[PDB]
Subunit: 202 residues, 4 copies
């Protein structure tokens, strides 16, 4: 079974970019539920898999992907954020900084691309910076709902995720998702992104 991980900073530490009220609900309620529902779906899967019940194994895939994906994505999300005073918003250095310049022209090129993609997500979803381990390239992509980046390709590793579910910004920014996407860059932990990039693992 899985447990809700602690945040590496206080709930209020990403303000003003993200309010403490959102961080608290987002962590303790939304992420907590994915964890608990993933644990439950896993218990059922284990039974079905052991019993040779193919139909129930397939039936369980919706719940497994959604809550397991939910757990994966938010565990990553919390780690690719950091307070402005602790490195949040500081541009990536080294190879990732370079690779980003090579693939997107500049950090602002990437920020614009990911901001555009995030604003255009229909309904609930995520925008990602990823590393394609196969082709050795950085990619930008979105996933729907709680689908994790690896569902877009087995060789992809997420470096940065930005949650564009309404629960990620609505208490603070209401309908204005572009303002949320404008500000979130202030607390993006590019150090985290760099380490994942350097190791090719989260």
């Amino acid at each position: 079974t899985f447990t809700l991980p602690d945040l590496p900073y206080d709930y209020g530490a990403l303000e003003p970019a993200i309010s403490g009220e959102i961080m608290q609900i987002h962590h303790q309620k939304h992420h907590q539920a994915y964890v608990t529902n993933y644990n439950n779906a896993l218990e059922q899967l284990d039974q079905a898999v052991n019993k040779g019940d193919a139909s129930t194994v397939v039936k369980l895939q919706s719940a497994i992907k959604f809550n397991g994906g939910g757990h994966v994505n938010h565990s990553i999300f919390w780690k690719n954020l950091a307070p402005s005073s602790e490195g949040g918003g500081e541009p990536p250095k080294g190879s990732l900084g370079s690779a980003i310049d090579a693939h997107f022209g500049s950090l602002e090129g990437l920020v614009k691309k990911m901001s555009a993609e995030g604003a255009a997500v229909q309904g609930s979803g995520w925008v990602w910076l990823g590393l394609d381990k196969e082709l050795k390239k950085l990619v930008v992509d979105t996933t729907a709902n709680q689908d994790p980046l690896v569902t877009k390709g087995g060789s992809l590793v997420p470096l940065v995720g930005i949650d564009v579910w309404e629960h990620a910004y609505y208490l603070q920014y209401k309908n204005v998702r572009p303002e949320y996407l404008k500000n979130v860059w202030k607390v993006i932990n590019w150090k985290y992104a760099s380490e994942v990039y350097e190791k090719e693992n989260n």
Copy 2:
């Protein structure tokens, strides 16, 4: 072609309280629906252009924006009409043929309510739960759609009778993460008179 406009609500913004806050009604109408309306108009202008120029690729590329914003407009226009203040019939059970049909298909009104609540609660991400009429069989269905897909994308002979918006902007300011509490209270302001009338004429 025709441009579309934001329809007026049939009641004041605060009229659905306490079930749905006036703050939610106002933003939902003036910001979310309006954006679907305006982005639908813009998509139509490009579509009209692409169709006239014989640009098949752009016609098809535009289907995403057309379905999302056209869908958004359809769905919210219905949503506003299938809500009503409690003092004007909101939350009063359906009478006549729809009431009969509901008892026939779902056992009872509460059976239907249980079903739609369960379905709405289980919607992953953004979407809608619907009570619909299949015009072919003259039968009732409950179904969900993702994002702003309207019920007609699940079958061309379907007519939506009642929609419940389960996008987070439909409830988050008031109920936060607790969608089931929203789904518990939304039934107080469901306009079953609208659903009955739609059922009766089948559109």
Copy 3:
């Protein structure tokens, strides 16, 4: 966990002629269904490993292959059983309660046949058309699924009674592009006896 095997057909490869050629039954069974079974078994081995190692990302990455090959196995196992040679009851109308429910829900057996045929003809790409039982409401439904998604992915309380495969490999060698002709003839060998039993037993 359990391994799965290709089930035997309840009749000879050629027994469904003229509606479905033996060449199709053979390749469809020995090659297509067999691949789903084997790829389902391989995905389960990786799933079991991932689940045991606490690897959420791999469990979720594997859901595509699990649903596709697991669904493929489920769907084809049902499909073989809801066909029968005309001389063994294939094409004979449902009796008992199902016949009644069909009359109640669709007007007549032909109302139903027209509906499933229209739905099958209209399937974009690969998929299935179903007569299903909603166990909660004790009601009949007609629905389609894409690729190898089983009916149970449309609602956990659904039980498939009759499936018609409208993947091109179910008909192409015999009917080529004319899927409606396939859908005209397949009704000669629909095993409504299986459907009744399932209906009666849920």
Copy 4:
């Protein structure tokens, strides 16, 4: 309205890679149907758009995308194929050849990648070599059913498509889609791809 385009070679000219029988049905029946139904859907679309019928405009989106996409994808397909004796299968020269080496290591790299993606398509679809006009990069991607590559990104332009619908190989290769995908490369028209790349239009 649209009309069925002539092929740039005889039905049998792509043998042995693709049989003349497939080419003939694929062109005259499958593509013809997409053209005719697109024409019908556009007429209905035109009425609904003129009448201000939002609900019907959206209902027609499924038919517009499938049949419109079908016309687009197959119109391209015919042009990015050519007889081996007339330039089919000759590696791309000039900028596209360079770009392929830059992005995929080698033409064989690209071929392996696209073949792998094609084999893994679940149900009906396409594998594409595309040009991202925004990022100025080559990409490989798949689409489902008749979705054209532009539904994956508004700035994408397809250079090469390979149809992996079963009707594209089944009469000849039956279930062995990997053998179809192995041979199709002998008749890929890389000169067409180059022209598109050089001008950024089909």
